[PDB]
Structure formats: structure tokens, C-alpha cells
Amino acid sequence: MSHKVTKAHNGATLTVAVGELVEIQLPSNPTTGFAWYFEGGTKESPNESMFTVENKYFPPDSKLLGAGGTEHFHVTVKAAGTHAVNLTYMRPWTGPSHDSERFTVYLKAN
Amino acid sequence: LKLPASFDAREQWPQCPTIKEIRDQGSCGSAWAFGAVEAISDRICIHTNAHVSVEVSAEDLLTCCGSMCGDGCNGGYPAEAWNFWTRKGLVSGGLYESHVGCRPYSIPPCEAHVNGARPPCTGEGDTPKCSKICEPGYSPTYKQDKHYGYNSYSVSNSEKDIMAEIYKNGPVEGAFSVYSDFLLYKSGVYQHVTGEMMGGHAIRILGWGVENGTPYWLVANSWNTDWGDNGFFKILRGQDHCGIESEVVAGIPRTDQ
């Protein structure tokens, strides 16, 4: 079914079938100019043929400017085998570093 | 003569370095502090005729305002920012690892240094402890380093009332709803074509102009120097576009030497 992954499971291997949905949801504070991204600063999947990906932001319930919420990546796996989702919490025009918070998970088909 | 068609405070006040300066909030949601301290520094300078010039620490407003201003790196209120100013003070403090003033900003962008790169740039981690101790070597001690404000008012939702305030008095703070395409912004008069709501964001309006027939506010961001135009940007003016004219606030500094 929907498989629910968070920051506590960075670097896990989740088993899945073709086409089940994976909510990967992580904190993201976009007001700082840092969102989560695949390599190259894009939210699209590097391989649209291995898996397909959408994301959304969810602001917080507060009027505090600079309050931060939660990003979801709704990853559907489209092919058999194992799949690293590598996201990085960074500022796209500036690019990642050793110091960027990183997130990965390994999606395994069948 | 009442009011120019183009205005830029950087070039109206040459002798005030800060008005040109673009700080960087790192990963905290603290622009709410940044917009205040940045106008405050500008105002202090302007309202002494460049006889006093100082980078006001955002670490100060960031770390010692507690809940009366909001939540630190989890977000805050510009207007609360300014009377915390007026009623406590705010010390000198500069950029990450500058070693300028009493409290330098203690959060980094993420590329350059690794040793004790210290609190890193993780998820929604805590704000820094309120420290109230000057960096070693910085000379005037904590409470004597404080600059106070006179008051803090809001500007009404007016275009003419904001251009007045800015031209008499220097840059203000304000805020606007940020939507996806905003971060995607690289030059021009921003206007929202798409994206959902991202949240509100505090900023510093220093000026105005018309380009390509589109009237606009000159705003300074707190996302470093390689965002946008050297940290700066433009946003459509006159239409309360994204609340940019809605929430403006300023003070007059207590200048008693």
C-alpha cells in the first residue's frame, strides 16, 4: 500500500511493488530558500523510467513568517530492481556541499 | 516637487555601507529578524548622517526574544521585532564567521567551512541559546553594545505612504506571501504566475522604479549574494501584490549618544 517514509528512515531499504505509492515526507522550510531536490536542483525523478515522482509543500498552521512545514515526494516505482531516491536539502542556484542535510532511501521492486 | 519616480537608498545614502549589504539567514526561518536589523542599521546610519554606522546583530533579536517575537528559527513577527528593539536593545553583530561586532550571526550557508562547522543545516532544528556574551576580542561588553529604538509603527496599506516613509526615513521591513515560482525567480519584476503558497517572508524594501512599463519595489533578500540580482529583487508595485504593501513596519532610532 501507501508506504510512509520519514527522516527516521534515511538510508533504509523499503520493499515495494510496481506502482504502490511512497510518501516520503521530510521537514522543509522554503522561506530560507532551501528546498529538497534530486541532483541538479530539480524535483523531477532522474529516471522517469525507473520511477515517477511528484512532490507538494504543506505550510504550517501558524501566522509566524519563517515558520516551516513539510515536503512530500509521492514516488511510484515503475520498473523491477532497486532504486536510490537521493534528495538533498539545499539552495539550488548555490548547489549542495559536505555540509548539506541529505536524504536517501532504497526502493526495491518484487 | 513631492516624490521621485525612481528611488534607491543605496545611492541616495552613499556613506552608509549597510544599505548595500545583503545578509544570509542560512537554514533558519529568521528573515523576520533580518529585515528588521537590516533597516535598523540603515536607519541608525541615516539618522546620524553616517556619523554612526553599525551592523546590528540578528543573532541578538534571533536568540534573546523568546516567544514574545515567535519561535526563533521556526518563524516570527516583524512588528514584535521592532519593539524588542525599542525596549531592550540590539547589539552589533555581522555575518557568519566575519568576527564583526558583538554577536556575529552564528548560522551558516552550507558550502565553505568544515571543522566544527558546529550546528549544521539540518531539518527544523532548534534556535541557538540566547548567549548575551560578546565574541572573544570584541571590545565593548554585552549591555553597553546595545542600540535602542524610539518606537515602532506600521505603515498603512498605501503605496504613497510607503514611498514617503522610505524617502524621509530609510528602508523599511515588510513581508509577502511567497509561492513556488518565487524561488524560481532570477531577474525582473516578479509577479506570481504559478505555484501554491509557500508561506510569508519578511524582507527590506529600500526603493522603487518602473521597468518594462511595470512599476515595482526594490527589495533585498536574506538568501546570500548569488540569489537574484546580487541578493536583490523586484516585485510588482501598486497592486498589493502578494501582501507586499500590507505589512510594513519601521522605527526611528533613539539617538542619545
UniProtKB/Swiss-Prot annotation, chain A:
Keywords assigned: Cytoplasmic vesicle, Protease inhibitor, Thiol protease inhibitor
Predominant place of localization: other
Gene Ontology CC terms: cell surface; ciliary pocket; cytoplasmic vesicle
Motif FG loop, residue range(s) on this chain: 91-100
UniProt xrefs under InterPro entries: Chagasin-like_sf, Cys_protease_inhibitor_I42, Prot_inh_I42_chagasin
Motif (BC loop): 29-34
Family under the similarity heading: Belongs to the protease inhibitor I42 family.
Domain characteristics, as noted in the entry: The BC, DE and FG loops form a tripartite wedge that blocks the substrate-binding site of target cysteine proteases. The BC loop interacts with the catalytically active cysteine and histidine residues of the protease catalytic center.
Its job: Cysteine protease inhibitor. Inhibits cysteine protease cruzipain.
Name this polypeptide is given: Chagasin
Organism, scientific name: Trypanosoma cruzi
Curated annotation (Swiss-Prot), chain B:
Disulfide bonds: C16-C45, C28-C73, C64-C130, C65-C69, C102-C134, C110-C121
Originating species: Homo sapiens
Upper lineage: Eukaryota, Metazoa, Chordata, Craniata, Vertebrata
Glycan-bearing residues: N115
Residues bearing the modification N6-acetyllysine: K143
Protein name: Cathepsin B
Active site (record annotation): A31, H201, N221
Domain of life of the organism encoding this protein: Eukaryota
Portion of the full-length sequence here: 78 to 334 of 339
Primary gene name: CTSB
